[PDB]
Symmetry: C3
Subunit: 183 residues, 3 copies
């Protein structure tokens, strides 16, 4: 069945530190009870565009959050802009915002919201991507399901690095993962 | 849902590593035609592998969870995973009756042959790293091997191992995705 | 379209890295709508890359396998992979006739543009690590790049490289799974 995506162009669609400073490319394809996900990031401007940890040793991580309501609709506090997220139609999107995508949401039994109960690590997936496609420029992408407040479901991407990069543009290789679907 | 075989997504223990029901293996196998998309994680709740302390027990560095299947893809009871809640999905639960056939979910025997006298290829293994407690400095290796057990027609085995000296670290993991070639 | 397009899962050599038919590339592409789920491994059986010795040949550190496709997603004969056994799956074999169209299996050209004077973004690359002989201390990097070859409409290229100093180690790998955005 279907695919929810950001069209795979390079037009900025995401706000990390300043308005439209990045293009998140995210494709979610439903394969029954699992969602197959493919993600990459291009930071085009602003604080995170060029990393220089000699001049700014403190800049070592940032987060992009996707927050969804009970119908699986993206909420406006998300870093990703609402106009950019929809079911695929060709290399573009359907012309009208979708009303329902619960089949694409991370499963709440697998990945419960924060509560008074024990929190398990299975709601996280780690991966490594590479800045500029260079094998000696790893950064970690940590993806977490359903851990944000103010929403019914969430997918968050935390990008971090441990090396001292000097004038390295933050644009990444791609990473694939999956997660258990709500229905 | 006859495209997903799973353990259910709850946290009720279903697996016996060192003692009865000491762990929850969460395993979801989704059939995408000739490939099975697999998602796995592990929570150990009790016993020898629950709290790792390699200062006190320096030799506790690895363990294995085996799923063994018959010619029909039915789980055999000396697998570490219990039979009761390994089944086709129905909602967040399972279908009511135990399944009789799941050959479409078994690892392909031409791709991943049983042990024999013939050359053994590495393609029957997938390696991944998961993280204890979700902490990025607590890696452990998950090694998954297809059809290398005897006394069965098919098998999937998960070997968990680590090389750091962990001190009072609970063995509960992040999730890992992989795929394998299906028998049919 | 649920189909699988593959090399078949046997171990018969189908690929030419340094000399004719020196390797078996096992590649399985399954279409899951707008994404292709890919599973890959490599067995080198002869020639320069069969047994690696970096004490005697320290500069032998990488090689490349290219799949080049025309406008219809048909494999071009200058690819390293041979055309004879690359086809849609039928059982553990292939459909009898060579396929004529597989555009839905090609890497998306907007996501992964062909080479030009325009900025080359890294999103057209996926990196993974596989293990020689299934040994966890024998990593090698598999770098996969989409649509960066000339003389074709689409391409998938696999660059295998390593940084350890291997001494008489056979180049045969564990398996790796990735996905990519489909052209249609
Ligand atoms: Zn710039
Ligand atoms: Zn515990
Ligand atoms: Zn050999």
């Amino acid at each position: 069945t279907r695919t929810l995506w950001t069209t795979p162009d390079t037009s900025p669609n995401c706000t990390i530190a300043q308005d439209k400073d990045s293009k998140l490319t995210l494709v979610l394809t439903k394969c029954g009870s699992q969602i197959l996900a493919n993600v990459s990031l291009i930071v085009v401007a602003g604080k995170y565009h060029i990393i220089n940890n000699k001049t700014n040793p403190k800049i070592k991580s940032f987060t992009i959050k996707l927050l969804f309501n009970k119908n699986g609709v993206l909420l406006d506090n998300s870093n990703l802009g609402k106009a950019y997220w929809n079911f695929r139609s060709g290399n573009s999107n359907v012309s009208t915002a979708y009303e329902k995508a619960i089949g694409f949401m991370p499963n709440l039994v697998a990945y419960p919201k924060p509560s008074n109960s024990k929190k398990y690590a299975r709601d996280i997936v780690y991966g490594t991507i590479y800045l500029g496609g260079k094998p000696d420029q790893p950064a970690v992408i940590k993806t977490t399901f359903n851990q944000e407040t103010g929403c019914e479901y969430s997918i968050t991407f935390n990008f971090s690095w441990s090396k001292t990069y000097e004038n390295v543009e933050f644009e990444t290789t791609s990473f694939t993962f999956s997660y258990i679907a709500q229905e």
